[PDB]
mmCIF file of C-alpha atoms in Angstrom:
data_model
loop_
_atom_site.group_PDB
_atom_site.id
_atom_site.type_symbol
_atom_site.label_atom_id
_atom_site.label_comp_id
_atom_site.label_asym_id
_atom_site.label_seq_id
_atom_site.Cartn_x
_atom_site.Cartn_y
_atom_site.Cartn_z
ATOM 1 C CA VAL A 1 -16.840 110.771 70.240
ATOM 2 C CA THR A 2 -14.533 111.755 67.359
ATOM 3 C CA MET A 3 -10.936 111.969 66.147
ATOM 4 C CA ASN A 4 -10.703 115.380 67.784
ATOM 5 C CA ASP A 5 -10.866 113.761 71.214
ATOM 6 C CA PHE A 6 -7.609 111.894 70.863
ATOM 7 C CA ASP A 7 -3.916 112.707 70.581
ATOM 8 C CA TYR A 8 -1.765 110.441 68.347
ATOM 9 C CA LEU A 9 1.264 108.721 69.852
ATOM 10 C CA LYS A 10 2.637 105.852 67.842
ATOM 11 C CA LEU A 11 1.722 103.173 65.299
ATOM 12 C CA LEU A 12 0.975 99.774 66.816
ATOM 13 C CA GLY A 13 0.228 97.704 63.699
ATOM 14 C CA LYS A 14 -0.910 97.709 60.055
ATOM 15 C CA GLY A 15 -3.006 94.932 58.497
ATOM 16 C CA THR A 16 -4.533 94.616 55.026
ATOM 17 C CA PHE A 17 -7.892 96.101 55.997
ATOM 18 C CA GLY A 18 -6.558 98.965 58.160
ATOM 19 C CA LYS A 19 -4.262 100.007 61.017
ATOM 20 C CA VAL A 20 -3.963 100.255 64.835
ATOM 21 C CA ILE A 21 -2.506 103.229 66.726
ATOM 22 C CA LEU A 22 -1.728 104.032 70.358
ATOM 23 C CA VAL A 23 -3.742 107.088 71.355
ATOM 24 C CA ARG A 24 -4.713 109.018 74.475
ATOM 25 C CA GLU A 25 -8.174 110.359 75.329
ATOM 26 C CA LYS A 26 -7.905 114.117 75.825
ATOM 27 C CA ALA A 27 -10.521 114.628 78.568
ATOM 28 C CA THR A 28 -9.212 111.631 80.527
ATOM 29 C CA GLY A 29 -5.495 111.340 79.818
ATOM 30 C CA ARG A 30 -5.881 107.542 79.556
ATOM 31 C CA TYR A 31 -4.194 105.374 76.870
ATOM 32 C CA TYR A 32 -6.030 103.460 74.143
ATOM 33 C CA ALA A 33 -5.490 101.438 70.979
ATOM 34 C CA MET A 34 -7.528 102.726 68.061
ATOM 35 C CA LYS A 35 -8.281 100.232 65.297
ATOM 36 C CA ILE A 36 -9.017 102.055 62.031
ATOM 37 C CA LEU A 37 -10.530 99.939 59.227
ATOM 38 C CA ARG A 38 -10.564 100.914 55.552
ATOM 39 C CA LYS A 39 -14.335 100.750 54.783
ATOM 40 C CA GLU A 40 -13.780 100.196 51.074
ATOM 41 C CA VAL A 41 -10.766 97.919 51.609
ATOM 42 C CA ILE A 42 -13.470 95.643 53.044
ATOM 43 C CA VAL A 43 -18.139 92.448 66.433
ATOM 44 C CA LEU A 44 -16.325 93.019 69.786
ATOM 45 C CA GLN A 45 -19.469 94.763 71.079
ATOM 46 C CA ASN A 46 -21.047 92.938 74.045
ATOM 47 C CA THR A 47 -18.625 90.111 74.905
ATOM 48 C CA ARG A 48 -16.947 91.221 78.127
ATOM 49 C CA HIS A 49 -14.379 89.301 80.175
ATOM 50 C CA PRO A 50 -11.571 90.175 82.641
ATOM 51 C CA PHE A 51 -8.853 88.798 80.325
ATOM 52 C CA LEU A 52 -10.166 90.204 77.059
ATOM 53 C CA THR A 53 -9.524 93.818 76.122
ATOM 54 C CA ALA A 54 -12.812 95.717 76.212
ATOM 55 C CA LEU A 55 -14.096 98.044 73.500
ATOM 56 C CA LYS A 56 -14.234 101.604 74.820
ATOM 57 C CA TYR A 57 -15.685 103.553 71.899
ATOM 58 C CA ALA A 58 -16.821 102.754 68.391
ATOM 59 C CA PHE A 59 -17.354 105.460 65.771
ATOM 60 C CA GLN A 60 -17.260 105.719 62.000
ATOM 61 C CA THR A 61 -15.908 108.603 59.950
ATOM 62 C CA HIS A 62 -16.785 109.191 56.291
ATOM 63 C CA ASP A 63 -14.773 106.233 55.005
ATOM 64 C CA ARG A 64 -13.287 104.572 58.125
ATOM 65 C CA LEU A 65 -14.451 102.347 61.035
ATOM 66 C CA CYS A 66 -12.701 103.134 64.337
ATOM 67 C CA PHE A 67 -12.450 100.955 67.459
ATOM 68 C CA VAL A 68 -10.981 102.634 70.554
ATOM 69 C CA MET A 69 -9.907 99.838 72.903
ATOM 70 C CA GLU A 70 -8.422 99.463 76.361
ATOM 71 C CA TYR A 71 -4.656 98.875 76.156
ATOM 72 C CA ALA A 72 -2.770 96.940 78.897
ATOM 73 C CA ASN A 73 0.301 98.483 80.583
ATOM 74 C CA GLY A 74 2.572 95.548 81.153
ATOM 75 C CA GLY A 75 4.805 94.562 78.298
ATOM 76 C CA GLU A 76 3.752 92.183 75.604
ATOM 77 C CA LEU A 77 3.986 88.601 76.825
ATOM 78 C CA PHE A 78 6.443 88.049 73.996
ATOM 79 C CA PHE A 79 8.802 90.614 75.430
ATOM 80 C CA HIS A 80 8.580 88.937 78.818
ATOM 81 C CA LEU A 81 9.200 85.440 77.467
ATOM 82 C CA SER A 82 12.211 86.642 75.510
ATOM 83 C CA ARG A 83 13.997 88.000 78.586
ATOM 84 C CA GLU A 84 13.212 85.013 80.821
ATOM 85 C CA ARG A 85 13.831 82.695 77.840
ATOM 86 C CA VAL A 86 11.401 80.216 79.355
ATOM 87 C CA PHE A 87 8.743 80.406 82.087
ATOM 88 C CA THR A 88 8.274 78.098 85.083
ATOM 89 C CA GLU A 89 5.492 75.563 84.501
ATOM 90 C CA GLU A 90 3.679 77.443 87.301
ATOM 91 C CA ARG A 91 4.037 80.840 85.620
ATOM 92 C CA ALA A 92 2.726 79.291 82.377
ATOM 93 C CA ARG A 93 0.015 77.503 84.281
ATOM 94 C CA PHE A 94 -1.129 80.911 85.476
ATOM 95 C CA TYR A 95 -1.340 82.428 82.000
ATOM 96 C CA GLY A 96 -2.769 79.345 80.398
ATOM 97 C CA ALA A 97 -5.338 79.338 83.185
ATOM 98 C CA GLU A 98 -6.479 82.892 82.545
ATOM 99 C CA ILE A 99 -6.701 82.207 78.801
ATOM 100 C CA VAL A 100 -8.680 78.989 79.359
ATOM 101 C CA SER A 101 -11.070 81.091 81.462
ATOM 102 C CA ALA A 102 -11.600 83.524 78.587
ATOM 103 C CA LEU A 103 -11.871 80.739 76.027
ATOM 104 C CA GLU A 104 -14.629 79.102 78.062
ATOM 105 C CA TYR A 105 -16.567 82.355 78.175
ATOM 106 C CA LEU A 106 -16.296 82.983 74.449
ATOM 107 C CA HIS A 107 -17.108 79.414 73.453
ATOM 108 C CA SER A 108 -20.187 79.454 75.696
ATOM 109 C CA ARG A 109 -21.394 82.296 73.507
ATOM 110 C CA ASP A 110 -20.733 80.543 70.200
ATOM 111 C CA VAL A 111 -17.534 82.470 69.515
ATOM 112 C CA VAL A 112 -14.257 81.081 68.247
ATOM 113 C CA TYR A 113 -11.442 83.508 68.951
ATOM 114 C CA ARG A 114 -9.231 82.218 66.123
ATOM 115 C CA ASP A 115 -6.233 84.215 67.309
ATOM 116 C CA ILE A 116 -4.836 82.713 70.460
ATOM 117 C CA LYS A 117 -1.184 83.405 69.722
ATOM 118 C CA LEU A 118 1.776 84.756 71.690
ATOM 119 C CA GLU A 119 1.786 88.019 69.810
ATOM 120 C CA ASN A 120 -1.726 88.583 71.060
ATOM 121 C CA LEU A 121 -1.023 88.288 74.770
ATOM 122 C CA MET A 122 -0.197 91.316 76.869
ATOM 123 C CA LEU A 123 0.101 91.949 80.580
ATOM 124 C CA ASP A 124 -1.828 94.622 82.464
ATOM 125 C CA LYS A 125 -0.573 96.842 85.327
ATOM 126 C CA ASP A 126 -1.129 94.195 87.971
ATOM 127 C CA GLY A 127 0.342 91.468 85.755
ATOM 128 C CA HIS A 128 -2.843 89.645 84.683
ATOM 129 C CA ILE A 129 -3.113 88.440 81.101
ATOM 130 C CA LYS A 130 -5.020 90.488 78.540
ATOM 131 C CA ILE A 131 -6.057 89.086 75.156
ATOM 132 C CA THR A 132 -5.805 91.729 72.441
ATOM 133 C CA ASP A 133 -7.421 91.827 69.001
ATOM 134 C CA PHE A 134 -4.458 93.426 67.170
ATOM 135 C CA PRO A 135 5.842 81.891 61.662
ATOM 136 C CA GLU A 136 2.051 81.587 61.721
ATOM 137 C CA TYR A 137 1.168 78.294 63.489
ATOM 138 C CA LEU A 138 -2.345 77.762 62.131
ATOM 139 C CA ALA A 139 -4.149 74.608 63.239
ATOM 140 C CA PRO A 140 -4.115 71.512 60.958
ATOM 141 C CA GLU A 141 -7.860 71.501 60.252
ATOM 142 C CA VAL A 142 -7.427 75.141 59.195
ATOM 143 C CA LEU A 143 -4.624 74.173 56.829
ATOM 144 C CA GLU A 144 -6.535 71.203 55.417
ATOM 145 C CA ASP A 145 -10.256 72.022 55.485
ATOM 146 C CA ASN A 146 -10.050 75.702 56.349
ATOM 147 C CA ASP A 147 -12.131 74.618 59.372
ATOM 148 C CA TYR A 148 -12.420 77.210 62.155
ATOM 149 C CA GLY A 149 -14.123 75.197 64.856
ATOM 150 C CA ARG A 150 -13.750 76.020 68.550
ATOM 151 C CA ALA A 151 -11.055 73.395 68.603
ATOM 152 C CA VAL A 152 -8.634 75.832 66.971
ATOM 153 C CA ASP A 153 -8.527 77.951 70.119
ATOM 154 C CA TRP A 154 -7.229 75.036 72.171
ATOM 155 C CA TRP A 155 -4.621 74.466 69.488
ATOM 156 C CA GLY A 156 -3.627 78.127 69.819
ATOM 157 C CA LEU A 157 -3.458 77.615 73.577
ATOM 158 C CA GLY A 158 -1.244 74.600 73.060
ATOM 159 C CA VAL A 159 1.235 76.413 70.794
ATOM 160 C CA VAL A 160 1.447 79.207 73.396
ATOM 161 C CA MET A 161 1.964 76.852 76.400
ATOM 162 C CA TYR A 162 4.597 75.003 74.370
ATOM 163 C CA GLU A 163 6.555 78.136 73.601
ATOM 164 C CA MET A 164 6.115 79.459 77.149
ATOM 165 C CA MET A 165 7.441 76.250 78.687
ATOM 166 C CA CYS A 166 9.871 75.107 75.980
ATOM 167 C CA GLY A 167 11.299 78.509 75.170
ATOM 168 C CA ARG A 168 10.753 77.825 71.433
ATOM 169 C CA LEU A 169 8.119 76.948 68.796
ATOM 170 C CA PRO A 170 7.497 73.234 68.044
ATOM 171 C CA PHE A 171 9.478 73.362 64.798
ATOM 172 C CA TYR A 172 11.976 76.177 65.405
ATOM 173 C CA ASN A 173 14.639 73.783 64.082
ATOM 174 C CA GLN A 174 13.164 73.337 60.586
ATOM 175 C CA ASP A 175 12.895 75.978 57.838
ATOM 176 C CA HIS A 176 9.611 77.949 57.554
ATOM 177 C CA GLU A 177 9.100 76.637 54.027
ATOM 178 C CA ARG A 178 8.225 73.196 55.355
ATOM 179 C CA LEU A 179 5.965 74.430 58.171
ATOM 180 C CA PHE A 180 2.821 73.344 56.283
ATOM 181 C CA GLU A 181 3.811 69.664 56.046
ATOM 182 C CA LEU A 182 5.242 69.510 59.553
ATOM 183 C CA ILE A 183 2.150 70.774 61.333
ATOM 184 C CA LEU A 184 0.096 68.412 59.179
ATOM 185 C CA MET A 185 2.318 65.337 59.297
ATOM 186 C CA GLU A 186 5.112 65.847 61.863
ATOM 187 C CA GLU A 187 4.677 64.540 65.398
ATOM 188 C CA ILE A 188 5.655 67.171 67.969
ATOM 189 C CA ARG A 189 8.536 66.429 70.386
ATOM 190 C CA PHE A 190 8.989 67.679 73.977
ATOM 191 C CA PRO A 191 12.056 68.480 76.151
ATOM 192 C CA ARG A 192 13.082 66.000 78.861
ATOM 193 C CA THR A 193 12.969 68.485 81.759
ATOM 194 C CA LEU A 194 9.236 69.078 81.132
ATOM 195 C CA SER A 195 7.051 67.559 83.847
ATOM 196 C CA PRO A 196 4.943 64.433 83.185
ATOM 197 C CA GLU A 197 1.763 66.546 83.559
ATOM 198 C CA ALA A 198 3.090 69.276 81.223
ATOM 199 C CA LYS A 199 3.874 66.926 78.316
ATOM 200 C CA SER A 200 0.409 65.500 78.748
ATOM 201 C CA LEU A 201 -1.243 68.903 78.428
ATOM 202 C CA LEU A 202 0.683 69.795 75.287
ATOM 203 C CA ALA A 203 0.246 66.391 73.791
ATOM 204 C CA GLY A 204 -3.533 66.750 74.054
ATOM 205 C CA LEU A 205 -3.760 70.400 73.039
ATOM 206 C CA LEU A 206 -1.549 69.866 70.003
ATOM 207 C CA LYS A 207 -3.325 66.803 68.602
ATOM 208 C CA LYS A 208 -3.829 67.118 64.856
ATOM 209 C CA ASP A 209 -7.332 65.639 64.825
ATOM 210 C CA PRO A 210 -9.679 68.284 66.331
ATOM 211 C CA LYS A 211 -12.057 65.613 67.660
ATOM 212 C CA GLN A 212 -9.165 63.967 69.493
ATOM 213 C CA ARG A 213 -7.664 67.201 70.778
ATOM 214 C CA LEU A 214 -8.051 68.309 74.389
ATOM 215 C CA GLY A 215 -10.911 70.738 74.523
ATOM 216 C CA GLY A 216 -12.161 69.171 71.296
ATOM 217 C CA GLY A 217 -14.786 66.982 73.000
ATOM 218 C CA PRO A 218 -18.413 68.166 73.456
ATOM 219 C CA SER A 219 -17.862 69.392 77.012
ATOM 220 C CA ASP A 220 -15.292 71.878 75.622
ATOM 221 C CA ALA A 221 -13.186 73.554 78.347
ATOM 222 C CA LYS A 222 -14.053 71.032 81.093
ATOM 223 C CA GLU A 223 -11.583 68.616 79.535
ATOM 224 C CA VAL A 224 -8.843 71.262 79.676
ATOM 225 C CA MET A 225 -9.818 72.565 83.111
ATOM 226 C CA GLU A 226 -9.864 69.098 84.687
ATOM 227 C CA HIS A 227 -6.529 68.009 83.252
ATOM 228 C CA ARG A 228 -3.961 66.878 85.781
ATOM 229 C CA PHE A 229 -1.796 69.826 84.772
ATOM 230 C CA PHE A 230 -4.431 72.197 86.129
ATOM 231 C CA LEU A 231 -5.027 70.478 89.499
ATOM 232 C CA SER A 232 -3.846 73.427 91.563
ATOM 233 C CA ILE A 233 -6.187 75.875 89.869
ATOM 234 C CA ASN A 234 -9.228 77.477 91.446
ATOM 235 C CA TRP A 235 -11.357 78.292 88.373
ATOM 236 C CA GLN A 236 -13.780 80.515 90.207
ATOM 237 C CA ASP A 237 -10.704 82.302 91.565
ATOM 238 C CA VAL A 238 -8.921 83.055 88.304
ATOM 239 C CA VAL A 239 -12.051 84.624 86.882
ATOM 240 C CA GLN A 240 -12.297 86.878 89.991
ATOM 241 C CA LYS A 241 -8.584 87.717 89.684
ATOM 242 C CA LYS A 242 -7.900 86.392 93.173
ATOM 243 C CA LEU A 243 -4.624 84.643 92.213
ATOM 244 C CA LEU A 244 -1.426 86.630 92.716
ATOM 245 C CA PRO A 245 0.234 87.288 89.357
ATOM 246 C CA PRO A 246 3.525 85.309 89.157
ATOM 247 C CA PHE A 247 5.231 88.418 87.866
ATOM 248 C CA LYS A 248 4.609 92.073 88.412
ATOM 249 C CA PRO A 249 5.090 94.152 85.233
ATOM 250 C CA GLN A 250 6.728 97.015 87.160
ATOM 251 C CA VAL A 251 4.536 99.992 86.203
ATOM 252 C CA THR A 252 3.293 102.674 88.643
ATOM 253 C CA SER A 253 -0.232 103.170 87.249
ATOM 254 C CA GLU A 254 -2.340 102.896 84.112
ATOM 255 C CA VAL A 255 -0.783 105.976 82.498
ATOM 256 C CA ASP A 256 2.861 105.143 83.306
ATOM 257 C CA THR A 257 3.628 105.427 79.577
ATOM 258 C CA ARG A 258 6.733 103.249 80.149
ATOM 259 C CA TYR A 259 6.221 99.930 78.305
ATOM 260 C CA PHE A 260 5.060 101.766 75.179
ATOM 261 C CA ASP A 261 8.843 102.313 74.808
#
């Protein structure tokens, strides 16, 4: 595989060590996201899961590292939360359930995702969540001890479920400057409308002390899975993609270039 097999479309993102572009395989007409890393500026391989974007191809040039990955067709979950403003606790339960499924798989392989954040969640054609590897609300132990334990994924989950159900970040009402002290020393507050089970989920997922945090115990995801908030979930079902997505993206196929804009 080489650069000559793809047609450029648009730029998707640009980090320090490289960039990501939306491309289209020429012999297949299918859409992809190519991650190009500046060799000098400086995994993904075998970990496969329904809610994680898979790696299609991987080739190097003379001075670049390229990663051609599957790119979902729904919009970005951020786009969808904007419009709706806020999701129903059931709609969030769905997403949070798919993510928890993926986080269990990764953690059972000794992998900490590190990037469970709204900007990383997309929807596929049928409306299922897709975790992509494309104010930053870093976890407290990351801000204090630069500690990237598995616990940080649950914290990422918590910030996402909070925004999805509250319609806003935990400290949207307090200047970015003081984000560092807040996360570290400010208790998080929840809306009144929120259900008793919902507040409980967020309270446990957003606990500053990683050992206290939900998911932070030795049995990892079991704590999260068996939380009252997730009583209606069929774990073996989500992983099979048996649940009906609570929202259908509105795309004809996986080439309906729509949502790319």
